[PDB]
């Protein structure tokens, strides 16, 4: 982005990530790094130690803290002190955190200069319009019974994998794919993410993924017409730009965090065709009824409501029964899945061997 929008010559740019660690030797240059590679204290490798000294030795003139809602954490804030700079800027769409550390930003980087409305930019064509929805997938009788007895930590996996959610996700994916839409399916739970992906034969990304493979998946999802949908995870929650993505679904969630909902919605707020007549992006939220998920769902969209977004309750998807094949339509498969998820908890002697 830096190269494309301004005349920054490539020679003066050095990217300090886990892959490459070379630093610009020209008098004045640019360093784009990450907190994990700059906030570490105990164990730095030899290759990454020279670079850190290079960063610390020079007196920088400007620091850009992208996603500044994470700088007041226990250790990330240390970088703001170690790195010498005369100007500090913070860029974040959401300025909220569960703890009380948000106010700490005042003495770390300074006050809040400017804020912008969401609906104002939406009606001016700068960001896309989204019809937020919340689908109520009533838990099937068989699964629900176990939800009563099981403890809190396993109950989560139980109400994330109810078959009705599989059917709703499968119906929506097929319906929107026919509409020529690029869909993203978020899930903070990795086991469900893999199960959904392998069941629907679609690529997925999660934390264990090497940087290149997820990059290859991202590029394919952007330009390959056959791969219309992917399956992201908590890694893609923020700061990943997909101008082609238009629809968005989520099957799991990180409890009551209001920010993750907004950051996830951001993936589709920049859809390319956000100015053609009548276009409306989509953000679905599949939640199991009569479960603790509704408690978190009504709580994790309290920030979008303040901005102006309104969630619409969808009890039933019209035309969902006539779809040819639905996952776990027979009780046999439902029973099999229930147990499957329930069970989740002398150099010469060298020749001898």
């Amino acid at each position: 982005q830096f190269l494309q929008w301004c005349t920054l010559q490539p020679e003066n740019c050095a990217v300090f990530t886990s892959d490459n660690k070379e630093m610009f030797q020209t008098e004045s240059g640019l360093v784009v790094s990450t907190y994990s590679m700059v906030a570490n204290t105990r164990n730095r490798s030899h290759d990454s130690q020279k670079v850190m000294d290079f960063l610390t030795g020079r007196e920088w003139g400007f620091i850009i803290l992208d996603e500044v809602h994470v700088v007041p954490a226990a250790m990330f804030r240390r970088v703001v002190s170690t790195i010498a700079a005369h100007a500090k800027l913070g860029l974040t769409a959401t300025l909220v955190r569960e703890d009380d550390k948000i106010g700490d930003l005042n003495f770390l980087i300074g006050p809040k200069l400017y804020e912008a409305n969401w609906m104002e930019l939406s009606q001016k064509g700068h960001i896309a319009n989204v019809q937020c929805a919340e689908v109520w997938c009533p838990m099937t009788a068989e699964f629900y019974q176990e939800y009563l007895r099981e403890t809190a930590r396993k109950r989560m996996l139980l109400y994330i994998m109810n078959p009705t959610k599989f059917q709703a996700c499968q119906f929506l994916i097929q319906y929107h794919e026919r509409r020529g839409d690029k869909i993203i399916v978020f899930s903070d739970n990795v086991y469900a993410l893999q199960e959904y992906a392998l069941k629907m034969g679609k690529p997925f990304i999660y934390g264990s993924t090497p940087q290149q493979e997820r990059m290859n998946i991202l590029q394919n999802f952007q330009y390959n017409d056959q791969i219309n949908t992917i399956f992201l995870s908590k890694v893609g929650d923020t700061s990943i730009d997909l101008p082609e993505a238009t629809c968005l679904i989520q099957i799991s969630s990180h409890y009551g965090s209001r920010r993750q909902e907004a950051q996830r919605l951001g993936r589709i707020l920049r859809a390319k065709r956000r100015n053609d007549e009548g276009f409306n992006a989509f953000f679905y939220s599949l939640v199991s009824k009569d479960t603790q998920e509704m408690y978190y769902s009504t709580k994790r969209q309290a920030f979008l409501v303040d901005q102006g977004y309104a969630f619409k309750v969808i009890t039933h998807l019209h035309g969902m029964e006539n779809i040819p094949n639905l996952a776990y339509a027979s009780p046999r498969e439902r029973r099999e899945l229930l147990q499957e998820v329930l069970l989740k908890n002398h150099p010469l002697i060298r020749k001898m061997y």
Partner: protein
């Protein structure tokens, strides 16, 4: 050609000596033969 170029005659040839004769562990693999390499745009 060099000898012709010393007498002031344009040589229609050149000395042939000047003819310069010119990662690891993957995550998802159920997409075995689907991912086309769109590396550049």
């Amino acid at each position: 050609p060099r000898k012709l170029q010393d007498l002031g005659l344009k040589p229609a040839s050149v000395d042939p000596a000047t003819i310069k004769r010119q990662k690891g562990k993957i995550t998802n693999t159920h997409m075995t033969g689907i991912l086309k390499d769109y590396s550049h745009r």
